Amino acid sequence: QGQLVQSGATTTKPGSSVKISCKTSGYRFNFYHINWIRQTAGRGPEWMGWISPYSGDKNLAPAFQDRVNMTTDTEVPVTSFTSTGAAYMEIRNLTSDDTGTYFCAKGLLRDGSSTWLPYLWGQGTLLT
Amino acid sequence: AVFLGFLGAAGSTMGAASMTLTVQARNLLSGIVKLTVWGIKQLQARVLAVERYLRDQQLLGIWGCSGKLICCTNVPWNSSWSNRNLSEIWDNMTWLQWDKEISNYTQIIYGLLEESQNQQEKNEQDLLAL
Amino acid sequence: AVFLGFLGAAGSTMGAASMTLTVQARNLLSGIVKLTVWGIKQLQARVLAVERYLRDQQLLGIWGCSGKLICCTNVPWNSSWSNRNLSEIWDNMTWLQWDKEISNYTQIIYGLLEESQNQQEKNEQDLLAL
Amino acid sequence: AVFLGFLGAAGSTMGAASMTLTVQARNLLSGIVKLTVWGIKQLQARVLAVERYLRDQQLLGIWGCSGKLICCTNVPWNSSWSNRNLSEIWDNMTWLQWDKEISNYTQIIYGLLEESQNQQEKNEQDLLAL
Amino acid sequence: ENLWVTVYYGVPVWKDAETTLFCASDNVWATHACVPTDPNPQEIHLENVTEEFNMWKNNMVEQMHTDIISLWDQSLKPCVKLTPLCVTLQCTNVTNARGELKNCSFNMTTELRDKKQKVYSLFYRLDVVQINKEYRLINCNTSAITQACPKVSFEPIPIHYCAPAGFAILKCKDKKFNGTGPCPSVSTVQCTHGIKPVVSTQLLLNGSLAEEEVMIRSENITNNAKNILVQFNTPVQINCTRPNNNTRKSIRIGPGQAFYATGDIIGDIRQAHCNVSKATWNETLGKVVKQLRKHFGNNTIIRFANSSGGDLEVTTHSFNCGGEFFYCNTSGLFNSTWISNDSITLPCRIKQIINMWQRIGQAMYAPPIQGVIRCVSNITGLILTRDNSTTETFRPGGGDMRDNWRSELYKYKVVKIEPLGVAPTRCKRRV
Amino acid sequence: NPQEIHLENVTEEFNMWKNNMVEQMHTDIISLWDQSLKPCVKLTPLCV
Amino acid sequence: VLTQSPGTLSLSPGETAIISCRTSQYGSLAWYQQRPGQAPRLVIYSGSTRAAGIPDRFSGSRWGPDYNLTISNLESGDFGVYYCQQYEFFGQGTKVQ
């Protein structure tokens, strides 16, 4: 029930790396995973990987394990059930094939068989 | 299981905190161990302890839940109280978040549970009248 | 139904007053809301409230009626207690008129209910010994 | 039967003393009948009476034994607690002799009875989820 | 779908509440009467829990501040009333050369109601006032006076505050937690830690240090009329002493009424004072001016000065040392303008006729402590008070006493447990 | 009606010297003595 | 740190007197009215809360660092000098006549 604003649409050239942010609000940042999804011009959508703001644990697709740099800060608690966190995103070997819109995504539940499912999405960040 | 302790799951899901009820059921009354400052003030606190406890046992008794830690009843869940799904409750928000959303309707529910019990032992009263 | 209130059916029939028990079951313990006159006298009254209440719960517990508002037992109705018909009681005299006629035999009945419960869990003790 | 009285079978067998439980179940709370010596000291004793009593009712409630004088459970008898035969206990040693031999393991048993009840209403919670 | 309500008993949910907390112990504070503290202090961590605190709305400090005042009046009831001492005093200076403590004689009552006696005693000038040489005790035209029982202890004992059954105390293990806001790491305790009710002023003594870095509090730091509470992370050692070797004389003033007077001074006559390490106080005053820039600016000047006026109990460092109440001039501690072997000695006075707290109605006579007095304490806190552009001066203050216990009870909060929760699930009862 | 119930087959270890009823009563009489002399006249002027 | 404008406001009984007051810091700003000879009178405090005995014509609004005070209908008694206040500082005044 909160927003997940990201960075702007920074366009670079292949070989370099791009930093993408994801500032949360309106929900406990440490209670839900942060997924990262992109939709490039050449494929459809592809699941990159999520990370736990509580356990600090990572799990990402083998197609992005040796490229993605994925970190999170620590939430600045506003109330008992509200906080403000941040999720970061970086790639390694960049090409024009990775040109697409990128967004972060808050996990679905806190327990069960769909704990990390991307429920609350960001806004989108246009890459190269 | 993990012995989280007293109120250990206050920030955990309602499905995880519901499986550790006898932990907070013990320390709600603690126990046993004459005119001064703390002396009169201790006895005033010892009386208040059993009063708030007997109110929760009296309320549980008139609902047919006397002796239950998890108690199922007849009153159906009104959508006006909380039109939320079953999965977005027991595997999401905590018992602290739940009490704030139900703080309004919590008095209406307490009356629905009372007559739902009186119109159950009265039905069973006729069920054993033959 | 008509919410007559606390003791609303004190002058009504025993059949009508028996269907509104959870009304006087709540206000028997009321609730929650340091050295002066009323201060010591209030704490003396708060203790007496829970003592008379626990006596009625202790008596209900040793009868197998713990948690019941209407409780059926095994002790048969002795005609010496009240040789009145069932229709001339529940649709006639009130609970106040009833207590005066049973004031004598009310102590014998309280003992018959106790051993009728001990010779029931003892029978069930053998019933589950196999 | 013979009305031996309060604690009449304190030196008798555990099988004979187990059939007269409602005798010591009454006088554990006695009953009903302002600033002096005994006045403050009487109120201090009246509060302690209901506290020790509610602890034994709270412990009985979280075991599923709320309302029972003899209560059967699920926890199996560990031979490390007392590797004695059933006939050399109920028709031999008294309840006073029994408490000394079990004084050690009596705290472990009290925890086994609590989770044996929570993992019973939780199982029944799923048993009525359909 | 098929969702009915289901009652849950024993759920982790609480509410903000204020109840009558009871004390536990392991003297005036009657700590022998508290319940014996449990040797096993259970602390349960409340994982995933965030709670909103506020040390300024906190009620444990309002209740304790009355539980100490009600303890003071409770301990002086059976002690001797020094009402016949309110008599015309004939005083001289004690032979020396400043004439401070006097040498007063007076016609005093005896055990027999028809006999008088001409006894003498020493009184510090802070306890007497002239008529027009003739003197009188300071409290006579104000209130009665009760002499402290010389068998009760003025020593702060670790007092543990506990919540009754059904209630709970909420800790806060955040090591940079300022007074208000939401504590991210919260745990629950049955009892608070060992609270030492050290009655102090300006400089908080024997308190609990802070981990990591030194934080300062105050509810609204920009409101100059709010006492700023600074809490050190390292302890600055302060040594105090009354070097005079005093004597105590018992004067029978009735059937069992024995007033204890100051006989004479054996040996030298010197000056009561206190010491701090100037190096430790210089680096600690640096630690305080460090965090003060995070609220006022990285370029503004921070000035330290002494008190601006008021009563004796506030303008000076007032406390207890061996059983006598000092009043230490702290002008030598607050005299540094900050921008970007050692020993500082404070001149302290001594009073026997004090009212304490600030109540107008009763004053206490502290019987003199026999022998030489010296006590070693740590100063762990500080109660400052700022004074129209970009340069902030700071002066010590000690208006309200309950700021002392508040510097120790900021980590706690009282909540009541309501274990009744109603929640839906596909469950119904049979017929 | 002073109810006395016989504990048949019962043997108990006693000790009148460790007994606490005598330590409590001895204080319940001392606390009764001081409690009864509070409103009574103090003979302090008689010390003449 | 308080800039109060205007300094003078010439109006007639029936108009609306609106007086602003810019502040550098953020806090609980208030307003005062001083009729000739009498003592100042508290009108608005904490930004927009109206004082006791003050008619509902007096109203205050806030948007960022700017605090405004407006009188819905001027009478012969509402003519005086008005001051804004935050903490211990005050404005130079605005005499309406």
Ligand SMILES: *[C@@H]1O[C@H](CO)[C@@H](O[C@@H]2O[C@H](CO)[C@@H](O[C@@H]3O[C@H](CO[C@H]4O[C@H](CO)[C@@H](O)[C@H](O[C@H]5O[C@H](CO)[C@@H](O)[C@H](O)[C@@H]5O)[C@@H]4O)[C@@H](O)[C@H](O[C@H]4O[C@H](CO)[C@@H](O)[C@H](O)[C@@H]4O)[C@@H]3O)[C@H](O)[C@H]2NC(C)=O)[C@H](O)[C@H]1NC(C)=O
């Ligand atoms: C405090 O609040 C936080 C945030 O809500 C809670 O953290 C969340 O807990 C829930 C339930 O405990 C988690 O959901 C589960 O997720 C696991 C996925 O983990 C598996 O895969 C991980 C990545 O591959 C891996 O790290 C795990 O391996 C272990 O090692 C890590 C090392 O860091 C260790 O930290 C882990 O704990 C693991 O033990 C693991 O292999 C998923 O498997 C779960 O599904 C199972 O369980 C459910 C029932 O719970 C069942 O229905 C399924 O069928 C399946 O059997 C479950 O979905 C969630 O991931 C956590 N993190 C979030 C939400 O961000 C924390 O528990 C709270 N603690 C307290 C004390 O309140």
Ligand SMILES: *[C@@H]1O[C@H](CO)[C@@H](O[C@@H]2O[C@H](CO)[C@@H](O[C@@H]3O[C@H](CO[C@H]4O[C@H](CO)[C@@H](O)[C@H](O)[C@@H]4O)[C@@H](O)[C@H](O[C@H]4O[C@H](CO)[C@@H](O)[C@H](O)[C@@H]4O)[C@@H]3O)[C@H](O)[C@H]2NC(C)=O)[C@H](O)[C@H]1NC(C)=O
């Ligand atoms: C506060 O003020 C009080 C006064 O109210 C002081 O108390 C007095 O102190 C003086 C000393 O400063 C005392 O005077 C001394 O008394 C001694 C007792 O002897 C008396 O009794 C014998 C009988 O046995 C008589 O023969 C004798 O004359 C005395 O009457 C004397 O022995 C002392 O004599 C000393 O001085 C003389 C003259 O200088 C010398 O020749 C002697 O050798 C000797 O050195 C002296 O006279 C007086 O008694 C005290 N009064 C009381 C009531 O106790 C306090 O000391 C003072 N306190 C402070 C801190 O200032």
Ligand SMILES: *[C@@H]1O[C@H](CO)[C@@H](O[C@@H]2O[C@H](CO)[C@@H](O[C@@H]3O[C@H](CO[C@H]4O[C@H](CO)[C@@H](O)[C@H](O)[C@@H]4O)[C@@H](O)[C@H](O)[C@@H]3O)[C@H](O)[C@H]2NC(C)=O)[C@H](O)[C@H]1NC(C)=O
């Ligand atoms: C801050 O805390 C300090 C320590 O917690 C306090 O210091 C204490 O001050 C009191 C009184 O001022 C002292 O009590 C004195 O005890 C000595 C005798 O003690 C010596 O002998 C015993 C043997 O029985 C030995 O164990 C000691 O270590 C000493 O060697 C007497 O002169 C008196 O009876 C007097 O009561 C404490 O001893 C002293 N503690 C320490 C550790 O120094 C200080 O007072 C506190 N400050 C404030 C303002 O409260």
Ligand SMILES: *[C@@H]1O[C@H](CO)[C@@H](O[C@@H]2O[C@H](CO)[C@@H](O)[C@H](O)[C@H]2NC(C)=O)[C@H](O)[C@H]1NC(C)=O
């Ligand atoms: C104690 O000593 C002080 C200091 O010498 C005396 O103070 C003097 O008091 C007189 C009053 O008659 C003044 O005229 C002097 O100016 C004071 N001197 C100083 C330096 O302030 C005091 O009077 C002495 N007290 C007694 C009882 O002798």
Ligand SMILES: *[C@@H]1O[C@H](CO)[C@@H](O[C@@H]2O[C@H](CO)[C@@H](O)[C@H](O)[C@H]2NC(C)=O)[C@H](O)[C@H]1NC(C)=O
């Ligand atoms: C004054 O100084 C320090 C404050 O840290 C205390 O001495 C240390 O106390 C801690 C905690 O008990 C011990 O672990 C250290 O070993 C102590 N240090 C030394 C050198 O002994 C001391 O107790 C404080 N006194 C107070 C607060 O009264």
Ligand SMILES: *[C@@H]1O[C@H](CO)[C@@H](O[C@@H]2O[C@H](CO)[C@@H](O)[C@H](O)[C@H]2NC(C)=O)[C@H](O)[C@H]1NC(C)=O
């Ligand atoms: C302070 O003065 C007292 C007496 O006024 C001194 O006590 C004496 O101590 C010695 C031991 O060295 C004993 O032999 C004496 O009998 C004591 N005298 C009395 C009257 O009890 C004490 O030593 C002095 N202390 C200091 C530090 O000066």
Ligand SMILES: *[C@@H]1O[C@H](CO)[C@@H](O[C@@H]2O[C@H](CO)[C@@H](O)[C@H](O)[C@H]2NC(C)=O)[C@H](O)[C@H]1NC(C)=O
């Ligand atoms: C306060 O007093 C204490 C105790 O007298 C001083 O600690 C002593 O310091 C010296 C010099 O370093 C050491 O030799 C002693 O061993 C210390 N005493 C103890 C008991 O450890 C302390 O230095 C004094 N501080 C001030 C500021 O005066």
Ligand SMILES: *[C@@H]1O[C@H](CO)[C@@H](O[C@@H]2O[C@H](CO)[C@@H](O)[C@H](O)[C@H]2NC(C)=O)[C@H](O)[C@H]1NC(C)=O
């Ligand atoms: C506390 O000490 C300071 C100095 O350390 C005293 O300051 C004196 O103040 C008076 C005026 O009140 C001046 O005439 C003196 O010159 C000052 N002395 C010094 C050394 O600067 C101050 O008076 C002391 N406090 C009290 C209550 O006496």
Ligand SMILES: *[C@@H]1O[C@H](CO)[C@@H](O[C@@H]2O[C@H](CO)[C@@H](O)[C@H](O)[C@H]2NC(C)=O)[C@H](O)[C@H]1NC(C)=O
């Ligand atoms: C002093 O108190 C004021 C009033 O409560 C605080 O002002 C608020 O500050 C917060 C945080 O920036 C803002 O969100 C509010 O809009 C402010 N309200 C007002 C009326 O100004 C101020 O923050 C406090 N001082 C400090 C240093 O925090």
Ligand SMILES: *[C@@H]1O[C@H](CO)[C@@H](O)[C@H](O)[C@H]1NC(C)=O
């Ligand atoms: C829900 O509650 C409202 C009152 O808040 C009541 O009018 C309505 O009949 C209820 N509906 C159900 C389905 O319980």
Ligand SMILES: *[C@@H]1O[C@H](CO)[C@@H](O)[C@H](O)[C@H]1NC(C)=O
């Ligand atoms: C409960 O009532 C208050 C009345 O002010 C209302 O503001 C609040 O929204 C209600 N609770 C819910 C969950 O709607």
Ligand SMILES: *[C@@H]1O[C@H](CO)[C@@H](O)[C@H](O)[C@H]1NC(C)=O
């Ligand atoms: C009725 O009670 C009397 C004692 O009052 C008893 O002797 C008799 O056996 C009882 N009869 C029945 C049928 O219960």
Ligand SMILES: *[C@@H]1O[C@H](CO)[C@@H](O)[C@H](O)[C@H]1NC(C)=O
């Ligand atoms: C109860 O006993 C009294 C004894 O005096 C008797 O008068 C009364 O009639 C008895 N009650 C009934 C209902 O017979």
Ligand SMILES: *[C@@H]1O[C@H](CO)[C@@H](O)[C@H](O)[C@H]1NC(C)=O
């Ligand atoms: C008996 O108790 C011991 C601990 O005292 C435990 O290790 C063992 O598993 C138990 N065995 C049975 C059969 O209950």
Ligand SMILES: *[C@@H]1O[C@H](CO)[C@@H](O)[C@H](O)[C@H]1NC(C)=O
């Ligand atoms: C209980 O523990 C004590 C420990 O000293 C031991 O001596 C005793 O034998 C134990 N009880 C039994 C029945 O073994």
Ligand SMILES: *[C@@H]1O[C@H](CO)[C@@H](O)[C@H](O)[C@H]1NC(C)=O
């Ligand atoms: C005691 O009383 C007498 C009465 O004559 C008087 O002369 C003397 O000065 C008094 N003592 C004191 C110390 O005032």
